[PDB]
PDB file of C-alpha atoms in Angstrom:
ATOM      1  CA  UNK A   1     -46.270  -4.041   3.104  1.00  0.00           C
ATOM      2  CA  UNK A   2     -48.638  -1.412   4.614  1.00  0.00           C
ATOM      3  CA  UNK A   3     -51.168  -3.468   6.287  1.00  0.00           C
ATOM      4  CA  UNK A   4     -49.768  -2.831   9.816  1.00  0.00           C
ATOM      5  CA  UNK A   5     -51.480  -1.764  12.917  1.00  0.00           C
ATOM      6  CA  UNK A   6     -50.252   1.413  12.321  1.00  0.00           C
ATOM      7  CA  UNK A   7     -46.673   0.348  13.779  1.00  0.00           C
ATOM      8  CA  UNK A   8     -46.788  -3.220  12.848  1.00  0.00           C
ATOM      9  CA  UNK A   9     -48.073  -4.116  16.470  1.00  0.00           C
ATOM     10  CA  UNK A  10     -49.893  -2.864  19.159  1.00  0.00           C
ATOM     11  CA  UNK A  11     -46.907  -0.540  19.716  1.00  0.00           C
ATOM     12  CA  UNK A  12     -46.693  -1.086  23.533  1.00  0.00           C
ATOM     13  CA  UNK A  13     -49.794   0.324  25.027  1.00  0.00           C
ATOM     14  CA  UNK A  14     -48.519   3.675  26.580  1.00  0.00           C
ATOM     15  CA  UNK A  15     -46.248   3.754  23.729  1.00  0.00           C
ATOM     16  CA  UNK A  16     -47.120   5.571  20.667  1.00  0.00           C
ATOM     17  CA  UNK A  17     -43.734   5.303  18.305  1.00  0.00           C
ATOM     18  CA  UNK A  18     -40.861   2.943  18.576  1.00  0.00           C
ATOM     19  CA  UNK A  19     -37.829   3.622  16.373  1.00  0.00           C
ATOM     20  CA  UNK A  20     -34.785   1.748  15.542  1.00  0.00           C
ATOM     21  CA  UNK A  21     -30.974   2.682  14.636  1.00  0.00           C
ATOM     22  CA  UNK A  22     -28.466   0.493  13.497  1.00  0.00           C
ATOM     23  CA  UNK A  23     -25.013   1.304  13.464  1.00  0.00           C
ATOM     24  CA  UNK A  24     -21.897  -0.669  12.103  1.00  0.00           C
ATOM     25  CA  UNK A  25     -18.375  -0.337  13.152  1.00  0.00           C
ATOM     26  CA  UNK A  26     -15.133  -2.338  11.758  1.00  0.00           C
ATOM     27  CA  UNK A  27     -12.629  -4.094  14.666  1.00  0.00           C
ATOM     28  CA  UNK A  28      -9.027  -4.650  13.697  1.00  0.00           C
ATOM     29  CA  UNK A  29      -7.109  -6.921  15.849  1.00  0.00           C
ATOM     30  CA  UNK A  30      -4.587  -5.321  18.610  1.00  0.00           C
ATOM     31  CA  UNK A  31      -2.951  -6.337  21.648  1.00  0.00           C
ATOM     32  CA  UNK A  32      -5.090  -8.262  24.098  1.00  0.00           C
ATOM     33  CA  UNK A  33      -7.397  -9.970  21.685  1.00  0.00           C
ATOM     34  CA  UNK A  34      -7.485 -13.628  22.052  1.00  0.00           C
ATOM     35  CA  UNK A  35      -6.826 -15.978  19.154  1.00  0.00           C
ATOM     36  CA  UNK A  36      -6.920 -19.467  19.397  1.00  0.00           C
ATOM     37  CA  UNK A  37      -6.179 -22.959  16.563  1.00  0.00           C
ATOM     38  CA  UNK A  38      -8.205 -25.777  15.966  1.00  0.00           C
ATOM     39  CA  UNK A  39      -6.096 -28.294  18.135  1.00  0.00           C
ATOM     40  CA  UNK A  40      -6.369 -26.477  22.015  1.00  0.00           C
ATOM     41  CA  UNK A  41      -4.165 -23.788  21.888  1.00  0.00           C
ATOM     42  CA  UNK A  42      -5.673 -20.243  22.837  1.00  0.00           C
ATOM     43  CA  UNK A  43      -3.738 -17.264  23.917  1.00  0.00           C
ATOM     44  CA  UNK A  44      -3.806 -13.493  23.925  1.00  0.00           C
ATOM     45  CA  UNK A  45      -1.758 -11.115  21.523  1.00  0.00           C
ATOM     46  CA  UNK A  46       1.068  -9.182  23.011  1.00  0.00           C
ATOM     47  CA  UNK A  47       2.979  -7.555  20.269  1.00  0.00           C
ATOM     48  CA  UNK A  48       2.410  -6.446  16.391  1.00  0.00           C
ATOM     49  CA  UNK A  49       5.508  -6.517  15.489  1.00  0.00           C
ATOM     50  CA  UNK A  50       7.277  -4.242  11.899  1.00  0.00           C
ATOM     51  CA  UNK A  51       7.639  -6.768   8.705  1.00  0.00           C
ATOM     52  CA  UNK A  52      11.495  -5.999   9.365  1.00  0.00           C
TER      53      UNK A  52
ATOM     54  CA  UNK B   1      47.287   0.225   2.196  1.00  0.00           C
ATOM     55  CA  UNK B   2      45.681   2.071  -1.172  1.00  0.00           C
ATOM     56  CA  UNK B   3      43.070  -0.895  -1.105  1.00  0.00           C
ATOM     57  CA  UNK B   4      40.550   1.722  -0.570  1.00  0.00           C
ATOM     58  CA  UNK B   5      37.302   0.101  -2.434  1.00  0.00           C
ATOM     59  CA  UNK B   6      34.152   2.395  -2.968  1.00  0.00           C
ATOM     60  CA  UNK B   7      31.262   0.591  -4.223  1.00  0.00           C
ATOM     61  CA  UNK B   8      29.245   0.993  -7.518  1.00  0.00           C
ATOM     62  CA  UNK B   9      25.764   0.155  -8.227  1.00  0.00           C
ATOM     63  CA  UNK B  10      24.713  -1.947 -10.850  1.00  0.00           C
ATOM     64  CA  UNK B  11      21.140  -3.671 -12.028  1.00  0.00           C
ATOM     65  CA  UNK B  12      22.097  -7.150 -12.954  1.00  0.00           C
ATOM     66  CA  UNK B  13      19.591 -10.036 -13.933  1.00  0.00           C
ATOM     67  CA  UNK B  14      16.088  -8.082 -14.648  1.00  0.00           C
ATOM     68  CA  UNK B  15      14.258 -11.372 -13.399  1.00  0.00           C
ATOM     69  CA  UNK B  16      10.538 -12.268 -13.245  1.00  0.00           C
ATOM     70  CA  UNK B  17       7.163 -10.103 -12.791  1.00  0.00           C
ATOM     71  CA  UNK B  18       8.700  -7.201 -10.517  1.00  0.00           C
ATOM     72  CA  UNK B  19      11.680  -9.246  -9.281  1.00  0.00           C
ATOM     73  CA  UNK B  20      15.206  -8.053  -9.610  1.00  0.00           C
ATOM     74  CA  UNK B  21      18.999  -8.129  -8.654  1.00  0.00           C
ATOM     75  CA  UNK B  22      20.626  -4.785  -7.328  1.00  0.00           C
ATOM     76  CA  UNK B  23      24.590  -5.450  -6.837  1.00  0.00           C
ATOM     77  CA  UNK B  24      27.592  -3.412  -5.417  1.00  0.00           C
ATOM     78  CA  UNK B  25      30.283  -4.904  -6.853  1.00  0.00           C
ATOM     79  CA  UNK B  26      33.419  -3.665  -5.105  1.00  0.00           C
ATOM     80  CA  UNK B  27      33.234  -3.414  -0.867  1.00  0.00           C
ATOM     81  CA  UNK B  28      35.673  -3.069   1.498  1.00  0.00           C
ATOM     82  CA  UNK B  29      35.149  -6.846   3.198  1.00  0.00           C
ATOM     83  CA  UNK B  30      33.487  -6.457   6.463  1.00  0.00           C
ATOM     84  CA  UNK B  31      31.169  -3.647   5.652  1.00  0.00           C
ATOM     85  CA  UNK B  32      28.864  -5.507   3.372  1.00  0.00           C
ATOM     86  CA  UNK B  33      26.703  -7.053   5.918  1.00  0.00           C
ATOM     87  CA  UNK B  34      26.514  -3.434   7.480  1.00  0.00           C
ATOM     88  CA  UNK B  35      24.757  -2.207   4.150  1.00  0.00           C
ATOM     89  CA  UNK B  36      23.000  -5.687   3.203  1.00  0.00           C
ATOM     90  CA  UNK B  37      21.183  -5.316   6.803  1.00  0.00           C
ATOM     91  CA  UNK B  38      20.622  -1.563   6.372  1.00  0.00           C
ATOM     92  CA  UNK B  39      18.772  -1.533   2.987  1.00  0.00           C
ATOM     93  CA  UNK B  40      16.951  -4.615   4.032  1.00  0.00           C
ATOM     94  CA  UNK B  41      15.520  -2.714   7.013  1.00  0.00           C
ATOM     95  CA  UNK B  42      15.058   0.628   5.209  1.00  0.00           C
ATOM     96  CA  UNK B  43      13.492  -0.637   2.384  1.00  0.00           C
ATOM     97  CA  UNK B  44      10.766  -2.248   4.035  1.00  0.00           C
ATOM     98  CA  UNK B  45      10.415   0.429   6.605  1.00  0.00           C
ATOM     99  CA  UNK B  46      10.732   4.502   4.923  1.00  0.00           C
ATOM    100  CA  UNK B  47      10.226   4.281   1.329  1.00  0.00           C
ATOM    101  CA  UNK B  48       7.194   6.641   0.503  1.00  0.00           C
ATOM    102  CA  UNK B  49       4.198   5.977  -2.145  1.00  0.00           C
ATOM    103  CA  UNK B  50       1.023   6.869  -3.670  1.00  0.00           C
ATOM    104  CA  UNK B  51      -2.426   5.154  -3.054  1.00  0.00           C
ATOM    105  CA  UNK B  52      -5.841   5.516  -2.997  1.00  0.00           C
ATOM    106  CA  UNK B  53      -7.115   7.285   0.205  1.00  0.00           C
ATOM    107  CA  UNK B  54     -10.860   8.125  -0.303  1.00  0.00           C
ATOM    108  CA  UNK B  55     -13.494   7.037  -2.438  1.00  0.00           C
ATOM    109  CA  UNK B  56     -17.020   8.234  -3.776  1.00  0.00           C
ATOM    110  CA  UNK B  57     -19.053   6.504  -5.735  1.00  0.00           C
ATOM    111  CA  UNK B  58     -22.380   7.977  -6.915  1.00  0.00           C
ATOM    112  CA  UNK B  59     -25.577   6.185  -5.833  1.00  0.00           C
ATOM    113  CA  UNK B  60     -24.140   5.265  -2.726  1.00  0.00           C
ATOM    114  CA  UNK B  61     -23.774   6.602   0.933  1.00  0.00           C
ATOM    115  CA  UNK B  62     -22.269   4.316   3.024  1.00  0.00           C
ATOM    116  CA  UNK B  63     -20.122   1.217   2.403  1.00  0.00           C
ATOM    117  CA  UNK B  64     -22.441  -1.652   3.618  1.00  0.00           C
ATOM    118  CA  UNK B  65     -24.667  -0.801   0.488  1.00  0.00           C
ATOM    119  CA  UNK B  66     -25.619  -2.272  -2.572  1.00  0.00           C
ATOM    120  CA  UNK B  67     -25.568  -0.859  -6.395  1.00  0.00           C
ATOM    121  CA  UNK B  68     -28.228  -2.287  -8.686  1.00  0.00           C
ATOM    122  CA  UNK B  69     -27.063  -4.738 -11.416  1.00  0.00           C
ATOM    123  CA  UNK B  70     -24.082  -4.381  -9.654  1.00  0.00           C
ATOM    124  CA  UNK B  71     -22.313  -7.761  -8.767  1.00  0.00           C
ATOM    125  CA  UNK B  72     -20.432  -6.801  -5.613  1.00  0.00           C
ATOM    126  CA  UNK B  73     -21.357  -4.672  -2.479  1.00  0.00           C
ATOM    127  CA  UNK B  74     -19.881  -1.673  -1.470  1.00  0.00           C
ATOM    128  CA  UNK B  75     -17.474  -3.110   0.726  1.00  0.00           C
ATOM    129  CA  UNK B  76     -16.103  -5.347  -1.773  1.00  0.00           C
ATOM    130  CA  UNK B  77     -15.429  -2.586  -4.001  1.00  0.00           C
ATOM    131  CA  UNK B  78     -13.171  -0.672  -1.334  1.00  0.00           C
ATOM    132  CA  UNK B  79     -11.281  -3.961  -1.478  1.00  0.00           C
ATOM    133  CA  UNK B  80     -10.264  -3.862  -4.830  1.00  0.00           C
ATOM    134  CA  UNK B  81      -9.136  -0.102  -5.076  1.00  0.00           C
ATOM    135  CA  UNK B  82      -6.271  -1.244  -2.814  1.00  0.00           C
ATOM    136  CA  UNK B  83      -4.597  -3.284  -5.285  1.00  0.00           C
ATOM    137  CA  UNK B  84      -4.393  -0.225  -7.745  1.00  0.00           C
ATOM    138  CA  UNK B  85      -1.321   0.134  -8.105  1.00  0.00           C
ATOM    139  CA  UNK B  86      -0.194   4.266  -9.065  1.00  0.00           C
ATOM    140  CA  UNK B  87       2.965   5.979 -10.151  1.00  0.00           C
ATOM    141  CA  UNK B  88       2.714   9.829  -9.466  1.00  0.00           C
ATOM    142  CA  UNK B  89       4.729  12.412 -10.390  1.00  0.00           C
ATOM    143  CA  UNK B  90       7.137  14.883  -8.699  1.00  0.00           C
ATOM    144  CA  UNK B  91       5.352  17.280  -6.951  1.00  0.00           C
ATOM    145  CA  UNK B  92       1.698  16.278  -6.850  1.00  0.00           C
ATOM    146  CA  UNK B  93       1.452  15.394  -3.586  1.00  0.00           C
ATOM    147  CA  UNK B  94      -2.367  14.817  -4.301  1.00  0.00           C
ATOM    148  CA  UNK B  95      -5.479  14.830  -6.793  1.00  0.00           C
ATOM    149  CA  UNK B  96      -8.656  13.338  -7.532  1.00  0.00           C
ATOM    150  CA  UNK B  97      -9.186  10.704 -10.132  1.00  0.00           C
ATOM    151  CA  UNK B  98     -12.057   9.931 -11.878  1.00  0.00           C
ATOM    152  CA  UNK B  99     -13.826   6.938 -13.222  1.00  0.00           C
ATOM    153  CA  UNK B 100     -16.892   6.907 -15.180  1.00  0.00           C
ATOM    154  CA  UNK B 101     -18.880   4.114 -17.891  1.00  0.00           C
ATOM    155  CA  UNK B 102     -21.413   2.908 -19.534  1.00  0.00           C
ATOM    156  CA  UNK B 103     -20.506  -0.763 -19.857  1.00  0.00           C
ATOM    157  CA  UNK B 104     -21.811  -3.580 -19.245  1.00  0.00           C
ATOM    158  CA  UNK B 105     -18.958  -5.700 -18.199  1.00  0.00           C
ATOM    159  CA  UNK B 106     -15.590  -5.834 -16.236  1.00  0.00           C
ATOM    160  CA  UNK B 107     -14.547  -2.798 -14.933  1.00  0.00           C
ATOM    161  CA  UNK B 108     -11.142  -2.503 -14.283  1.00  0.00           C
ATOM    162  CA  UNK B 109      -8.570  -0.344 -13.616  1.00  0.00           C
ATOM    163  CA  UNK B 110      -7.817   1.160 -16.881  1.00  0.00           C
ATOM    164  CA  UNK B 111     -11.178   2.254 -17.029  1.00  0.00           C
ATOM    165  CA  UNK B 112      -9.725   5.271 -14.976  1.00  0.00           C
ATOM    166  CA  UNK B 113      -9.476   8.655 -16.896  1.00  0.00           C
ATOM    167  CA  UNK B 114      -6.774   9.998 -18.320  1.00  0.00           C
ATOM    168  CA  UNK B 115      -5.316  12.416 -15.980  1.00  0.00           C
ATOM    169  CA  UNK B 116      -1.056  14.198 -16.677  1.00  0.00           C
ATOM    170  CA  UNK B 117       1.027  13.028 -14.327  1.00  0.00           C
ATOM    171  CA  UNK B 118      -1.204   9.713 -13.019  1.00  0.00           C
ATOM    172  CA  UNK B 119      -0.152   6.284 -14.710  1.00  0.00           C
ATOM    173  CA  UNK B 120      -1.684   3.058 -12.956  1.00  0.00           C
ATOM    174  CA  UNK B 121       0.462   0.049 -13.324  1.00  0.00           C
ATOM    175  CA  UNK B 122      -1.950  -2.723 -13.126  1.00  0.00           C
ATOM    176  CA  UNK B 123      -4.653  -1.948 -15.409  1.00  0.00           C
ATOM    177  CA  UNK B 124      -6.370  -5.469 -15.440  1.00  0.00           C
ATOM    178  CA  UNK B 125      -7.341  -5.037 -11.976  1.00  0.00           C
ATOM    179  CA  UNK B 126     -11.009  -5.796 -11.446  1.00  0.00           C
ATOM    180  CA  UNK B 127     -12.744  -3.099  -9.439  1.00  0.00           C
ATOM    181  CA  UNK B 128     -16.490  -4.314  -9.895  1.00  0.00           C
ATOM    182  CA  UNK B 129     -18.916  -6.432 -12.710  1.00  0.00           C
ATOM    183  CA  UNK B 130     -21.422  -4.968 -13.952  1.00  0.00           C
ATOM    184  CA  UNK B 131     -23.935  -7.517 -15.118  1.00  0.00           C
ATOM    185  CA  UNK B 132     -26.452  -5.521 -17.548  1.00  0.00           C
ATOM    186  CA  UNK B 133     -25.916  -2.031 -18.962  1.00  0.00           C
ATOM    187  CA  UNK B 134     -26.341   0.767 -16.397  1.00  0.00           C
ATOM    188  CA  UNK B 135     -23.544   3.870 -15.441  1.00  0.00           C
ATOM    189  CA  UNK B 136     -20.915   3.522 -12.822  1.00  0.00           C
ATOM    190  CA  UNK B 137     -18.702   6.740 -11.633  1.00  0.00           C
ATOM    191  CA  UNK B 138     -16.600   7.235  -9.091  1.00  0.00           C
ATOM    192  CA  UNK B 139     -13.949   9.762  -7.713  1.00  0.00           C
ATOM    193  CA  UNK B 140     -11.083   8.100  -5.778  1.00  0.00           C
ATOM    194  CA  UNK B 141      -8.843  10.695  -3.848  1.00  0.00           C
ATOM    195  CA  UNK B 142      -4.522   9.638  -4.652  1.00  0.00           C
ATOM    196  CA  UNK B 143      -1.858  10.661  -2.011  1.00  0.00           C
ATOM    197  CA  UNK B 144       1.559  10.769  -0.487  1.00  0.00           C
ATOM    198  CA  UNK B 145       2.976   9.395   2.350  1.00  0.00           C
ATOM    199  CA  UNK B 146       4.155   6.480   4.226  1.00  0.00           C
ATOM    200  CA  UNK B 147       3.192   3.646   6.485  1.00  0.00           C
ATOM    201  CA  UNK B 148       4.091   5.139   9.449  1.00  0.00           C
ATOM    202  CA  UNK B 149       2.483   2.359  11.891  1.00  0.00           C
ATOM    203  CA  UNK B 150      -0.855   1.456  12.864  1.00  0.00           C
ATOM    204  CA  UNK B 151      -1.587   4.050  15.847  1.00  0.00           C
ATOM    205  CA  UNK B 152       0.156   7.089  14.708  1.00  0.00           C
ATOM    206  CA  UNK B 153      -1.832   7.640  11.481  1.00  0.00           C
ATOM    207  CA  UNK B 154      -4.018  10.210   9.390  1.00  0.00           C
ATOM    208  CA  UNK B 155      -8.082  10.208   9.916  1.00  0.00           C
ATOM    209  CA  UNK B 156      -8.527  11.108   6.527  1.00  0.00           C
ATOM    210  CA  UNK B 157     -11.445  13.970   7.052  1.00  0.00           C
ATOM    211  CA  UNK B 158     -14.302  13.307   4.703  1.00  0.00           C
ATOM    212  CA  UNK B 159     -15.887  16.409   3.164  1.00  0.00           C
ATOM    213  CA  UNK B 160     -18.968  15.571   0.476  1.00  0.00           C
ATOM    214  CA  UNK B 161     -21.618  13.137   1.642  1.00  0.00           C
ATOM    215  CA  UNK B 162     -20.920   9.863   0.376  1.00  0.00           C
ATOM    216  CA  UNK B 163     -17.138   9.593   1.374  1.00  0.00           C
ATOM    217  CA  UNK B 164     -15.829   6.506   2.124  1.00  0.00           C
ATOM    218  CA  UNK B 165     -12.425   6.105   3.743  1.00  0.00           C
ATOM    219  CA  UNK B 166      -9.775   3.517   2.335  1.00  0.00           C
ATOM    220  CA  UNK B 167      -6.628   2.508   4.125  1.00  0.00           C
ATOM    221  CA  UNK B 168      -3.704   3.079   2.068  1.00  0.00           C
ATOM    222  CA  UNK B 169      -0.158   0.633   1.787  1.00  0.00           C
ATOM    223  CA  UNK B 170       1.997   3.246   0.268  1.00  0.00           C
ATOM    224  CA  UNK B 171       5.390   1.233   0.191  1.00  0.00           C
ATOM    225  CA  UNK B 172       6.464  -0.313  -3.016  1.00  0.00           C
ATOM    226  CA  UNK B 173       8.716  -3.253  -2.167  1.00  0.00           C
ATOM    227  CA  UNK B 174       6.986  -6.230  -0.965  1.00  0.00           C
ATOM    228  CA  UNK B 175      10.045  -8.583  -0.007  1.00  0.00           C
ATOM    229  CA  UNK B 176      14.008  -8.204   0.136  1.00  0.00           C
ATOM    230  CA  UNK B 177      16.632 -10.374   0.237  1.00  0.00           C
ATOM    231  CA  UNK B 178      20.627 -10.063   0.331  1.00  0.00           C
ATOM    232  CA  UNK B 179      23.998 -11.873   0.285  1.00  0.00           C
ATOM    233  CA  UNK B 180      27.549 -11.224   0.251  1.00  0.00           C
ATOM    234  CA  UNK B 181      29.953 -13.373  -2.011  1.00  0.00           C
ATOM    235  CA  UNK B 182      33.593 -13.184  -1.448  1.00  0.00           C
ATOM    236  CA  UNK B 183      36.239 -12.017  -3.968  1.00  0.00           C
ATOM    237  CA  UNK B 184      39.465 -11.555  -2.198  1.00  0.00           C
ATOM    238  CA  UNK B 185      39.830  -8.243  -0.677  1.00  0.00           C
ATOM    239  CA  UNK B 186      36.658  -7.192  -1.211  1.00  0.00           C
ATOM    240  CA  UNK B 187      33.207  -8.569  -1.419  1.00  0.00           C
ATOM    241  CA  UNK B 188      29.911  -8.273  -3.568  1.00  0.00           C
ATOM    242  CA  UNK B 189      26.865  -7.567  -2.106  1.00  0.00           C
ATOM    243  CA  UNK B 190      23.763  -8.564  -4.044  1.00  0.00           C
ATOM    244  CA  UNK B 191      20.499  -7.390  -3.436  1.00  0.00           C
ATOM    245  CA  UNK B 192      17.160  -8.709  -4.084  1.00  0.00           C
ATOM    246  CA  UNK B 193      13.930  -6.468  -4.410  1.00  0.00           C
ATOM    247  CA  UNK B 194      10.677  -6.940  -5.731  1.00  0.00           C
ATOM    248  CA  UNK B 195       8.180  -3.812  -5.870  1.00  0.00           C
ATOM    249  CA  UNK B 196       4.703  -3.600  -7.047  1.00  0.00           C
ATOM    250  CA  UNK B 197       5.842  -1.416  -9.901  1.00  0.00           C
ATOM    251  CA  UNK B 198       5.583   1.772  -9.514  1.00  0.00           C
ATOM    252  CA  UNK B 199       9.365   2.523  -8.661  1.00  0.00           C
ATOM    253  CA  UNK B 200      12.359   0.981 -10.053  1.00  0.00           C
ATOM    254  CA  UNK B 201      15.178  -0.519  -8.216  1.00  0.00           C
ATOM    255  CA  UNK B 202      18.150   1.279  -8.651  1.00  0.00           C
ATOM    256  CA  UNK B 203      16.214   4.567  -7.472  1.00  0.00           C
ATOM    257  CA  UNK B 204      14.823   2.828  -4.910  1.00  0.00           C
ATOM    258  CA  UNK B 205      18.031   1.439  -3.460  1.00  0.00           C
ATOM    259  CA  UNK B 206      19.928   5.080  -3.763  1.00  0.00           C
ATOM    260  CA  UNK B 207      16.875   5.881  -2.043  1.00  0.00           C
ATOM    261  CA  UNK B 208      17.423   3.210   1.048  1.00  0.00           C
ATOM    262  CA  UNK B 209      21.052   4.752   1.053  1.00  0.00           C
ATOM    263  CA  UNK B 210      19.967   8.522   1.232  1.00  0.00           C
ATOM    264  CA  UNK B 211      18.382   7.787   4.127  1.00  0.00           C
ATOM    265  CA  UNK B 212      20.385   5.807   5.655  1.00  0.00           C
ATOM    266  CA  UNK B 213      23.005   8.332   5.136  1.00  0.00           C
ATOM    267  CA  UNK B 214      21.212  10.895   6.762  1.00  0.00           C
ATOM    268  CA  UNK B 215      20.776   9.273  10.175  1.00  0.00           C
ATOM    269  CA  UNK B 216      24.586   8.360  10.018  1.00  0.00           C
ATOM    270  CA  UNK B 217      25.325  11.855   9.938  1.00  0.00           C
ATOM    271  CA  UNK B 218      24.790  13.247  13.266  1.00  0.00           C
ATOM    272  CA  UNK B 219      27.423  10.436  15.070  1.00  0.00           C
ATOM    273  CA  UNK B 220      30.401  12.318  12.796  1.00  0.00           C
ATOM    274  CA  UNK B 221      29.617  15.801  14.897  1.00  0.00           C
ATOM    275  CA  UNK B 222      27.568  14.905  18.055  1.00  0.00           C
ATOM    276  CA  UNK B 223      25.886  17.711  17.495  1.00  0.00           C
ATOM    277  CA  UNK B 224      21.962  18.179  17.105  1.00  0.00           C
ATOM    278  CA  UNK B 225      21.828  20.071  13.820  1.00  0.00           C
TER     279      UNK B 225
END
């Protein structure tokens, strides 16, 4: 759990620290996304239309 | 003529879990479909609410985290305190609730304190399961307002660290129904509604008909205000 090579590689020779950054983001479904059924049938979303 | 009919609300047949039976008895045959189609579409369009529109819970900064001896994730969680269903009162407009055990099972809704003027209607909601003994506190932030579409919307700007934004469904009525019965001369017009419980359906219908009233009355003057 500490036994690296300092960066748990060689850390890219000419490199000296790599970092990472992860980011997470939530996608609602709108007009143009494409939805499809299990039986062939694919096609894009053109409306969200009211409950009324 | 002197057939002049002026309906009268009524609350027949209380039916079911939230499920009732609005009526107005006496109309003027022809204009019940007018008003059946009206409060339909109102209904389920402007009525205004209270839900849940920001969380915090303690140990916790974002929502793809994890509590110890905790058996959901954080994201979970924020799916549950959207079925809490909450009645406010008159002029609130909003507050901050406040939750706070040291349990070591269910939690549920009516683990909420007791705040004036707050009163959740489903208090066997599960919000998270705690599975040994540990202390779980959160502060959910309640508010006004209506679904007024999916673009056109409020960020809800977080202030404290570990804020966490929830999406809010602040209408009450879930699904509406009508029909119109003949009587000779006039015509009954029944009304089905079925809320989540936090309003009650003859306010809610006089509430449909306030508004409906309102837009009506700018074709009797064509006149802006």
């Amino acid at each position: 759990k500490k036994k690296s090579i300092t960066q748990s590689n060689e850390l890219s020779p000419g490199v000296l620290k790599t970092v990472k950054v992860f980011v997470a983001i939530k996608k609602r479904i709108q007009p143009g996304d494409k939805m499809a059924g299990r039986h062939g049938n694919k096609g894009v979303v053109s409306r969200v239309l009211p409950v009324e | 003529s002197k057939l002049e009919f002026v309906p009268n609300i009524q609350l027949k047949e209380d039916l079911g879990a939230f499920s009732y039976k609005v009526q107005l008895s006496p109309v003027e045959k022809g204009m019940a479909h007018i008003l059946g189609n009206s409060i339909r579409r109102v209904l389920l369009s402007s009525l205004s609410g209270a839900s849940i529109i920001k969380v915090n819970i303690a140990n916790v900064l974002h929502e793809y985290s994890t509590l110890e001896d905790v058996k959901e994730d954080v994201v979970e969680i924020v799916s549950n305190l959207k079925k809490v269903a909450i009645k406010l009162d008159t002029g609130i407009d909003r507050l901050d609730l406040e939750l706070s055990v040291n349990k070591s099972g269910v939690v549920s809704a009516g683990d909420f304190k007791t705040t004036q003027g707050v009163e959740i209607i489903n208090k066997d909601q599960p919000i998270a399961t705690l599975t040994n003994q540990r202390a779980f506190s959160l502060t959910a932030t309640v508010s006004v307002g209506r679904n007024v579409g999916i673009l056109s919307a409020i960020p809800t700007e977080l202030e404290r660290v570990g804020d966490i934004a929830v999406d809010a469904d602040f209408n009450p009525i879930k699904r509406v129904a009508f029909e119109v019965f003949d009587n000779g001369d006039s015509e009954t017009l029944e009304v089905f509604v079925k809320t989540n419980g936090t309003i009650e359906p003859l306010a809610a219908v006089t509430k449909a008909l306030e508004y409906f009233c309102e837009q009506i009355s700018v074709f009797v003057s064509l006149r802006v205000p």
